[PDB]
Design an enzyme around this catalytic site. Structure first.
Site, PDB file in Angstrom:
ATOM      1  N   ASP A 124       0.822  -1.193   0.000  1.00  0.00           N
ATOM      2  CA  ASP A 124       0.000   0.000   0.000  1.00  0.00           C
ATOM      3  C   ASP A 124       0.869   1.262   0.000  1.00  0.00           C
ATOM      4  O   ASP A 124       0.655   2.164   0.818  1.00  0.00           O
ATOM      5  CB  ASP A 124      -0.939   0.012   1.222  1.00  0.00           C
ATOM      6  CG  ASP A 124      -1.732  -1.268   1.387  1.00  0.00           C
ATOM      7  OD1 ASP A 124      -2.286  -1.788   0.402  1.00  0.00           O
ATOM      8  OD2 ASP A 124      -1.846  -1.725   2.540  1.00  0.00           O
ATOM      9  N   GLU A 131     -11.338   0.994  -3.046  1.00  0.00           N
ATOM     10  CA  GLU A 131     -10.432   1.472  -1.985  1.00  0.00           C
ATOM     11  C   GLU A 131      -9.210   2.184  -2.589  1.00  0.00           C
ATOM     12  O   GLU A 131      -9.169   2.423  -3.797  1.00  0.00           O
ATOM     13  CB  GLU A 131     -10.028   0.301  -1.066  1.00  0.00           C
ATOM     14  CG  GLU A 131      -9.042  -0.699  -1.678  1.00  0.00           C
ATOM     15  CD  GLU A 131      -9.044  -2.067  -1.019  1.00  0.00           C
ATOM     16  OE1 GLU A 131      -8.302  -2.958  -1.484  1.00  0.00           O
ATOM     17  OE2 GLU A 131      -9.771  -2.273  -0.034  1.00  0.00           O
TER      18      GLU A 131
HETATM   19  O1  ARA Z   1     -12.746  -6.573   2.223  1.00  0.00           O
HETATM   20  C1  ARA Z   1     -11.317  -6.511   2.297  1.00  0.00           C
HETATM   21  C2  ARA Z   1     -10.861  -5.090   2.027  1.00  0.00           C
HETATM   22  O2  ARA Z   1     -11.304  -4.235   3.083  1.00  0.00           O
HETATM   23  C3  ARA Z   1      -9.340  -5.042   1.894  1.00  0.00           C
HETATM   24  O3  ARA Z   1      -8.730  -5.336   3.146  1.00  0.00           O
HETATM   25  C4  ARA Z   1      -8.866  -6.041   0.839  1.00  0.00           C
HETATM   26  O4  ARA Z   1      -9.322  -7.360   1.164  1.00  0.00           O
HETATM   27  C5  ARA Z   1     -10.749  -7.481   1.267  1.00  0.00           C
HETATM   28  O5  ARA Z   1     -11.085  -8.800   1.683  1.00  0.00           O
HETATM   29  O1  ARA Z   2      -5.842  -0.638   3.552  1.00  0.00           O
HETATM   30  C1  ARA Z   2      -5.297  -1.640   2.700  1.00  0.00           C
HETATM   31  C2  ARA Z   2      -6.314  -2.032   1.625  1.00  0.00           C
HETATM   32  O2  ARA Z   2      -6.445  -0.974   0.655  1.00  0.00           O
HETATM   33  C3  ARA Z   2      -5.895  -3.324   0.932  1.00  0.00           C
HETATM   34  O3  ARA Z   2      -4.819  -3.072  -0.005  1.00  0.00           O
HETATM   35  C4  ARA Z   2      -5.505  -4.344   1.988  1.00  0.00           C
HETATM   36  O4  ARA Z   2      -4.420  -3.881   2.808  1.00  0.00           O
HETATM   37  C5  ARA Z   2      -4.830  -2.785   3.605  1.00  0.00           C
HETATM   38  O5  ARA Z   2      -3.723  -2.323   4.392  1.00  0.00           O
HETATM   39 CA    CA Z   3      -3.163   4.756  -0.090  1.00  0.00          CA
END
Ligand code: ARA
Ligand code: ARA
Ligand code: CA
Ligand code: NA
Length: 330
Positions: free
Chosen positions: A18, A229
């Site tokens: 990330d 995300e």
């Molecule tokens: O739902 C989660 C998401 O929040 C992120 O952590 C990636 O993996 C997924 O399973």
């Molecule tokens: O917040 C991040 C999410 O975006 C996904 O990449 C899973 O790892 C987590 O740390």
């Molecule tokens: Ca980021």
């Protein structure tokens, strides 16, 4: 030894994910998650990601030697945090450095906190409570040319964004995914202008509208394009670029607009799917070149929760479009 030449892992002694890259004091500082082999149950709520601290990384050149500055923040010293130190970011203002991080509080609800240092390398002292009015995950704190700072944030599914429609948490029995109305507009990421002191929001949180080339909202059923995300903001040629992960379709995509709040028009793919389920990135200019920092599960042999960060050059065209990167072609 120097690293970042041919899409190789930037570090191998720890697992990293990330990546949020910034240029501070003429160096590239990277603020990634520190992946560990917790061995917790893997599921669509992200329980397999059970990270407990952050390390700051830095490079003087790309490619270049990568310095690991040690533990910058440990969950045991964050008074409000219960578990799970997920994708962080950093910002610099008036000689102070701020580490922004998502974590679950003691009620298992994701919030975003800040920690403060005098150095971009940390270590950082956390504020005793999370940011008032924050929720969900994946902050990106963007400094605009006018000196204003904005936090972009949010993540659906395990990031809980779908449980915050009213401005209060809907509870642990609420939606595990999204709105569950695929013909309604998809959930948008969040934005708030930061306070002058960088510890709070200066306005009520806004939702960002993402639309297709016709100006119609991206729909909830459109998993190839809709926000999941990893929101990130950069500017090129005066245009604002909102990039993000699509999650279950495994893309980094981007959308363009004329101001921080959008709306943003979906343009295309930044990064095609990598090894491992997650895809998470940042985009930064350094010495007049643009770079895409990202991760994959290559170093761990494909384990979802044991990732490594990588970097490659990103190419904007003069018309504002970006060339799509496919991770394993050259
Ligand atoms: O739902 C989660 C998401 O929040 C992120 O952590 C990636 O993996 C997924 O399973
Ligand atoms: O917040 C991040 C999410 O975006 C996904 O990449 C899973 O790892 C987590 O740390
Ligand atoms: Ca980021
Ligand atoms: Na493209």
């Amino acid at each position: 030894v120097p690293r970042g030449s041919h899409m190789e892992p930037l570090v191998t002694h720890i697992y990293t994910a990330d990546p949020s890259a910034h240029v501070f004091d003429g160096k590239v500082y990277i603020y990634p998650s520190h992946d560990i082999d917790a061995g917790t149950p893997e599921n669509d709520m992200g329980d397999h990601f059970d990270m407990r601290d952050y390390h700051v990384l830095s490079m003087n050149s790309i490619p270049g030697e990568v310095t690991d500055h040690g533990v910058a923040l440990d969950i045991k010293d964050i008074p409000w945090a219960g578990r799970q130190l997920w994708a962080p970011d950093a910002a610099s203002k008036d000689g102070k450095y701020y580490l922004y991080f998502p974590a679950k509080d003691k009620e298992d609800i994701f919030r975003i906190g800040v920690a403060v240092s005098d150095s971009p390398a940390g270590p950082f002292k956390p504020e005793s409570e999370p940011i008032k009015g924050s929720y969900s995950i994946d902050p990106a704190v963007f400094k605009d040319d006018d000196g204003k700072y904005y936090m972009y944030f949010g993540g659906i599914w395990g990031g809980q964004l779908q449980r915050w429609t009213t401005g209060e948490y809907a509870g642990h029995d609420a939606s595990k995914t999204d709105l569950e109305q695929d013909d309604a507009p998809a959930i948008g990421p969040r934005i708030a202008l930061m306070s002058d002191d960088m510890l709070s929001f200066a306005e009520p949180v806004k939702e960002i509208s993402i639309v297709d080339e016709q100006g119609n909202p991206i729909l909830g059923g459109d998993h190839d394009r809709r926000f999941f995300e990893a929101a990130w903001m950069h500017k090129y040629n005066g245009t604002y670029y909102l990039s993000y992960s699509t999650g279950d379709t495994h893309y980094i995509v981007y959308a363009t607009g004329d101001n921080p709040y959008g709306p943003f028009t979906y343009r295309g793919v930044i990064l095609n799917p990598v090894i491992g389920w997650t895809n998470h990135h940042s985009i930064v200019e350094f010495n007049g070149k643009w770079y895409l920092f990202y991760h994959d599960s290559s170093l761990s042999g494909g384990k979802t929760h044991l990732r490594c960060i990588k970097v490659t050059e990103l190419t904007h065209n003069a018309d504002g479009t970006i060339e799509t990167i496919s991770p394993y072609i050259e």
